[PDB]
Amino acid sequence: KVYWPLYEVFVRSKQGLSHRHVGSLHAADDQMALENARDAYTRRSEGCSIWVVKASEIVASQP
Amino acid sequence: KVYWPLYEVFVRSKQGLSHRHVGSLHAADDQMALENARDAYTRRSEGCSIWVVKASEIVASQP
Amino acid sequence: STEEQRFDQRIAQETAIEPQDWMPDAYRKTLIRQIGQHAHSEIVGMLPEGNWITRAPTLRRKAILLAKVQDEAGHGLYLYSAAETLGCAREDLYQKMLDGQMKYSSIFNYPTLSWADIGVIGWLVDGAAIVNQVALCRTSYGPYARAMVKICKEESFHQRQGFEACMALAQGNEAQRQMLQDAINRFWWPALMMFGPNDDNSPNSARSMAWKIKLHSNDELRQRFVDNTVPQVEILGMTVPDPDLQFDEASGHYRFGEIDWQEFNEVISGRGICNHERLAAKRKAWEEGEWVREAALAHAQK
Amino acid sequence: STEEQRFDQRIAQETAIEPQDWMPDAYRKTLIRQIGQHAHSEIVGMLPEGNWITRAPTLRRKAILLAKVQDEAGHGLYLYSAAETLGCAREDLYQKMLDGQMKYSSIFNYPTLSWADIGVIGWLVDGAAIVNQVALCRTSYGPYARAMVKICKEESFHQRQGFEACMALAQGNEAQRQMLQDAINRFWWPALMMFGPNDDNSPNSARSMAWKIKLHSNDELRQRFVDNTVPQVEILGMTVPDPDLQFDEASGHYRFGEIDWQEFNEVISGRGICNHERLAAKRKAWEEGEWVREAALAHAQK
Amino acid sequence: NPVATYALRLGDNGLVLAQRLGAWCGHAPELEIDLALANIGLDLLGQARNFLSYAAELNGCGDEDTLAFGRDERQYSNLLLVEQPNGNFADTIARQFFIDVWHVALYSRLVNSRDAQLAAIAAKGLKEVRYHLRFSRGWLERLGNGTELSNRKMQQAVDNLWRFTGELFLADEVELSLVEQGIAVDPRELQAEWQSAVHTALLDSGLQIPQEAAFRSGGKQGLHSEHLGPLLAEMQYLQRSHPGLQW
Amino acid sequence: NPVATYALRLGDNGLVLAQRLGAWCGHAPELEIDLALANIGLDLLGQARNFLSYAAELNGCGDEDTLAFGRDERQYSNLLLVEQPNGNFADTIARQFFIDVWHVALYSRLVNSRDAQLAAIAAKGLKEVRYHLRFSRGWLERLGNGTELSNRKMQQAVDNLWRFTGELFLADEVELSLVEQGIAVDPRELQAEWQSAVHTALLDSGLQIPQEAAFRSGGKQGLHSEHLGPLLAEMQYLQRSHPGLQW
């Protein structure tokens, strides 16, 4: 039974200038996360860039 | 002589809703990248969240 | 403590709580509870409507239902992400759901016995969901509030589509009109129960209201649903199975009958019409799918 | 090829090229060249102004200069990031800079011989930079264009501050006025040369213009700088060291004298006033800092 | 008549496969797969609506709903492949991969059809089919080259569906006649593209191309497996009970 | 007079250390360090401007510029620590860490000063000092616990600066008198907080607290090392050449 770690998803829309964080999802690897994000968040729109990043790769500033 | 890999920087401003990609920088580790981003991109503004991610951690969709 | 006081002050000033901020452990846990069970609901909620995907009477209505069930799955994922910001694991809370240690919405334990039930769910069930969720767009925890904003945009479309399916029956043959009324008669009270127990039978409300998780009381939201929905029932030329429903000109509200609280407690405790079947289906999907998940992991590793 | 044709069409329609899009190898390389040398310039550009940080006549002017030099460093970093999207390495292009295999702006090979030179650099040098950089806000490669937008916002402030430092001298004592004029006399032609060679002595221009990297010609930008700046010289009650400068009412432009192209070629080929000193300083910083970088790496690894 | 029947065949394939994918809603190994399957199901139903709508326009009567809901199994003209049960996830993936690879090869060529409506429908469909193929080929590789257990299930899935692949390159006189007019694609000429894709993907997944010569056809002629009848009983029930209504 | 001299001392520390950091512009091991050093230099100069502006208001004449540019080394009252040369990166980091740790301990307490202007200046300064300390402590750890070579340089840096740490907790009658009025902080009472920070950071960096008893004072009294004179010659040149002007 595979691991399904957490991924953060960032999208830059067609006419958009920068990638904006739009949510999270669990996926077995980066390619499945991309595929899922494409469906869940972009609905397969042409011209949209998607970035996926495993959560563990993000270091946040301290409140 | 240390390695200075590339990091992507995402910031969410005080009144801001989501993290937006604002640029890149080279740094020896995640904590130095945060410190540098804080200065280079946020100018130490209160209430701003910074995320740094090594470039190698990002998988982009294919043009 | 200074931590506790700072938090109470941040709540009072309506500053969004974010995953890295300090929060009372009871606040963290009640949100894992609530967001997790909200996410569970999106998943189990696929099943009553999904029951009719292969049987939907036209290709257009079938395509709408498929999109809606797909949207629900996506809403589940949004909610699992938000719950994880609080430090829980999707897989663990899902497992608690399967074992019956976390709840999902009472509404999904009711069977779809006709095509009309599908339009009625889109209309009343998504209707009740929307009232609740719009009220949560100012919930105090940021990830949750932003999940509600993302979701209500998509969901109000599908609620409209379900009402339009209801209108087709309401304007159709006598058999279609009757189908609609029967579906309403069976789903009306279940939809009202989605708002939760009465305000003095609500354990949770005290903390949730104080910590601004809940912005309006169960009874407040339910009254607003009744007020907004009664005129939609009228538009369909239909009735409400409530002999005690009447407009009170004085208050400006519809006054409505007492909920069967004994049924509601049966349902949330696993003894409703479809409770066993719903959890069985989800358990069966999980177990039978194990080899696929293991395959995906073994392939990823290579 | 179909790749090549698609690219030419994307350029014609003004669609931003992004790091994952196909691009002609000559387009990739000329942008690594140009963005890299733009980034190199921000770094070497810290040195002429930095020369006066410890000597600045008031605490206010000293604080402004410190902020400006700090901004320049940040602009360098922005530009190195953008150049890296094209697949080069900051460390490698920096090393080429140190060895003299990549250029940086001709302007930074001129010495700061007085405090007035500092105000004049902020005014004329950042002035020329801004004209060039604003013109590049519609450069065809997205990362580059977005770097220019980010930078011009910060930089126009410091240009204004440098002009204000110039105005203080222009309104001050006779010795201050003279200091200003001498600084202008020494930095005027160097500032004009920042726009690059003439349009028929510019190898890259053909490709850069075609591929919309360069949106206006060297001569076009330079003329616009002269037109915008001459009235600012007048505001200061100062002169331009150009006996051939005059307004042409017919064209609506200032007509100006011929650049010393022999000096310009000396300078860009490493034989200017401060070329050796600038690269020596940067080489000295690199080499003497090696143990610190090695420390940082060894500590990170642990 | 030939063009109407040809168009209807492409619609039927899409419709029946769509039905099968719909059954997966909420029963998938992961929520992401649930979503992916529903997305593919939706694309295919969109394609069915397009082809069936055109077939109804070509015949001068009815619509996508008369066609989907009032024909019986002897009139349906889908490939036998798309009517195979979902079985396990590998069986679904085997069926999907064989169909997607075929749709990619088909729609690529049918987008140069001398029939403008057919060319347009195909131009839309091809973009979707490419996404479907990435998903299905991806899972073929993940399962075949996964565990020992997933590798066996994936080989079994391939073996079990292979006999129906012959229909993919079966040509009749509707195909041939329309192909000579530059309207249809001759299914026989799709074999090279389909085989180059499928044999490579099966190899890459560390699996075997079946040695059994594929022999099953009849779907295009209304000669179906015993699977179709019960599919239609379920799909058509409400329309049969309450015919001629708006929904 | 006591308050004016006290205020001036805090300004002078900030001013002189600021000058030193300015010399690093464009000479740092990495561009990020260049930026960080310039940021710290800028914060400290802001603090100097604040304290010196207040000292000028307290004296009833002059301003931050008369104070910075027209006093000689016998009138400057900075700690001897902040006037030490930059030396190598470890020397800069040692000096910065000792000062930041002291500024943190100081500004924390001086923000409860009965002098409202002093309390406000300190409230601003403390937020900055906390950032400075993270940076300087971070580098102390990275260098001491880095390579063998960086570990030696960092130990040498600490050793070389240690004798000047005594001034950090030196009290005179200006300190004492103002402290009894609840206005100043008695530097002697800063030792525990400073030592708990610095000894922990040196330990964590795998380094040694010097065994030498720190013995150097005089800065507060205008009795400076031979470093200050040439610093001021450079800092003050233009103002001396062209006095009484606006810039």
Coordinates of C-alpha atoms in Angstrom, one line a residue, chain A residues 1-2 4, chain C residues 284-299, chain E residues 24 27-30 33 86-94 139-140 142-144 146-157:
Chain A
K1 CA 0.0 0.0 0.0
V2 CA 1.6 3.2 -1.3
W4 CA 0.3 9.5 -0.3
Chain C
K284 CA -14.9 -2.1 0.2
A285 CA -13.3 0.6 -2.1
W286 CA -10.5 1.0 0.4
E287 CA -9.7 -2.7 0.9
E288 CA -10.2 -3.8 -2.8
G289 CA -8.0 -0.8 -3.8
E290 CA -5.1 -1.7 -1.5
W291 CA -3.2 -3.6 -4.2
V292 CA -3.4 -0.5 -6.5
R293 CA -2.1 1.9 -3.8
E294 CA 0.7 -0.6 -3.0
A295 CA 1.5 -0.8 -6.8
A296 CA 1.6 3.0 -7.0
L297 CA 4.0 3.2 -4.1
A298 CA 6.3 0.3 -5.3
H299 CA 6.5 1.9 -8.7
Chain E
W24 CA -16.3 3.8 -10.7
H27 CA -15.2 3.2 -5.6
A28 CA -11.6 4.0 -6.8
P29 CA -8.3 3.1 -4.9
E30 CA -7.6 6.9 -4.3
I33 CA -8.2 8.3 -9.3
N86 CA -14.8 -2.8 -15.1
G87 CA -13.4 -5.8 -13.2
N88 CA -10.4 -4.8 -11.1
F89 CA -8.4 -1.6 -11.6
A90 CA -6.0 -3.3 -14.0
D91 CA -8.9 -4.5 -16.2
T92 CA -10.2 -0.9 -16.3
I93 CA -6.7 0.4 -17.1
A94 CA -6.1 -2.3 -19.8
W139 CA -1.1 3.5 -14.8
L140 CA -0.1 0.6 -17.1
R142 CA 2.9 1.9 -12.5
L143 CA 1.0 -1.4 -12.2
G144 CA 3.1 -3.6 -14.5
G146 CA 5.0 -1.9 -9.5
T147 CA 4.8 -5.0 -7.2
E148 CA 4.8 -8.7 -8.1
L149 CA 1.1 -8.7 -7.4
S150 CA 0.3 -5.6 -9.5
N151 CA 2.5 -6.9 -12.3
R152 CA 0.4 -10.2 -12.4
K153 CA -2.9 -8.4 -12.3
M154 CA -1.8 -6.1 -15.2
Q155 CA -0.6 -9.0 -17.3
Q156 CA -3.9 -10.8 -16.6
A157 CA -5.9 -7.7 -17.5

